């Protein structure tokens, strides 16, 4: 019957999970991966300069 205003927070279709001390696998709206896990499996030149024996 009356005008109203609501306070609320964001949500989305994210499936990204994150861990904490008290809880594991917490789905979260946004997360940043900070661990690199891939390499090119090759020995390469370093900044335009290796001696391969």
């Amino acid at each position, epitope marked *: 019957p009356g005008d109203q205003i609501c306070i609320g927070y964001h949500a989305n279709n994210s499936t990204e999970q994150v861990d904490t001390i008290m809880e594991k696998n917490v789905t979260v709206t946004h997360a940043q991966d900070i661990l690199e896990k891939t390499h090119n499996g090759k020995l*390469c*030149d370093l900044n*335009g300069v290796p001696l*391969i024996l």
Partner: nanobody
Framework: EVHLQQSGPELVKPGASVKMSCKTS????????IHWMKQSHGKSLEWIGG????????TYNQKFKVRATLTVGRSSSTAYMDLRSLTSEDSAVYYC?????????????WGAGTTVTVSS
């Protein structure tokens, strides 16, 4: 040693095609990109192209994209170049050269030079 033995001097009728070969020896064929250089008799060096043996990826100069074709015989430890429909322009010397590392590399071992003569 790092020897690069290449094809013997050749003569081609204008409009025909050549296929000079370069035989690698002394190192692992599949670790370095091989390239071809053209030198207009006592003038300037021009870069033609490069090919990496292990998977056969090619990298060409604008100028030669059409007329040239780098190929590699892995069992043969051999790099080939093919020049199609020649002119007086192509009469010069061609060097089969091993470049050290990648896009930013220096050509350390230069072959003898296959010298092509285009005349009727």
């Amino acid at each position: 040693e790092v020897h690069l033995q290449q094809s013997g001097p050749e003569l081609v009728k204008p409009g025909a095609s050549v296929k000079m070969s370069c035989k690698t020896s002394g190192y692992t064929f599949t670790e370095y990109t091989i390239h071809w250089m053209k030198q207009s008799h006592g003038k300037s060096l021009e870069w033609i192209g490069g090919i990496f043996p292990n998977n056969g990826d090619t990298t060409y100069n604008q100028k030669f994209k059409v007329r040239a074709t780098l190929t590699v015989g892995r069992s043969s430890s051999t790099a080939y170049m093919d020049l199609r429909s020649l002119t007086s322009e192509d009469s010069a010397v061609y060097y089969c050269v091993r470049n050290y590392g990648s896009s930013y590399g220096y050509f350390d071992v230069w072959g003898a030079g296959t010298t092509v003569t285009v005349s009727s």
